[PDB]
């Protein structure tokens, strides 16, 4: 999920947008 | 833009930034 | 607990603190 | 909604808790 | 509500949240 | 103290209220 | 250092940065 | 007090330092 | 991405998120 | 400039990106 | 004042605090 | 640089002022 994608691993701001509604 | 570690409240702050008025869900359990 | 006056990202941080591992959804108007 | 209420007025942690998953 | 690790400025931010107008003390030395 | 309770270990928001005035 | 305009939790973060390990007390009016 | 002063007016780090333990 | 309304330190956090390892300069008027 | 624009008006992440080194 | 670890967004927030209207540069690459 | 000075190692608020413009 988001934590794995962005905290444990790294994510871009575009990947963060995956979690917008 | 960059790729970085975003954790905890910083992750949700980043989601706020990125999503804003769209809103977002933060669901750490998946 | 006390009542809160929270705007912008401060609300998101409060949601983060309140919901912990459950996470939360942030759903502004419009 | 809550995002507006907390900012234009006040809201409680208990009201916030309703927005947890 | 949840139990989480709250450290550093996040700890004081949480204290602000929880205490608000009551105020609070942050005394890491004990 | 608070750091041991809430940072080193974990604490609830109620335990945080222990440090309100 | 520069003068500061700090409201809400921003004041608490400033206190945290200024006081470091000494900690601090946050004491709003009323 | 300081909490009000910093928000409605301005305050210095030096004034803040008075609130350390 | 959405447009942003960012004041004070919120702008700095946004710059930090946007610029990542590149860093950034923060240059207010006056 | 950007610091004022983002606060008194709005600004985009893309405008912000101009301030990266 | 104190000496502490200031990292990431907390570092830039501290720079904002310390520098304010002077502005600052955050250049992690050196 | 600043990260080495203040994150990896520790720095004072005066050392932080080194990075003001
Ligand atoms: Cl952190
Ligand atoms: Cl604010
Ligand atoms: Zn942090
Ligand atoms: Zn703020």
Curated annotation (Swiss-Prot), chains B, C, E, G, I, K:
Domain of life: Eukaryota
Effect upon mutating residue 22 to Q: In MODY10; reduces binding affinity to INSR; reduces biological activity; reduces folding properties
Coiled coil stretches, renumbered: none
Reported effect, residue 24 to S: In HPRI; Los-Angeles
Protein name listed in UniProt: Insulin B chain
Organism: Homo sapiens (Human)
């Amino acid at each position: 999920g988001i934590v794995e994608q962005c905290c444990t691993s790294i994510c871009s701001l575009y990947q963060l947008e995956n979690y917008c509604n | 833009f960059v790729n970085q570690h975003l954790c905890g409240s910083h992750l949700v702050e980043a989601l706020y930034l990125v999503c804003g008025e769209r809103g977002f869900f933060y669901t750490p359990k998946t």
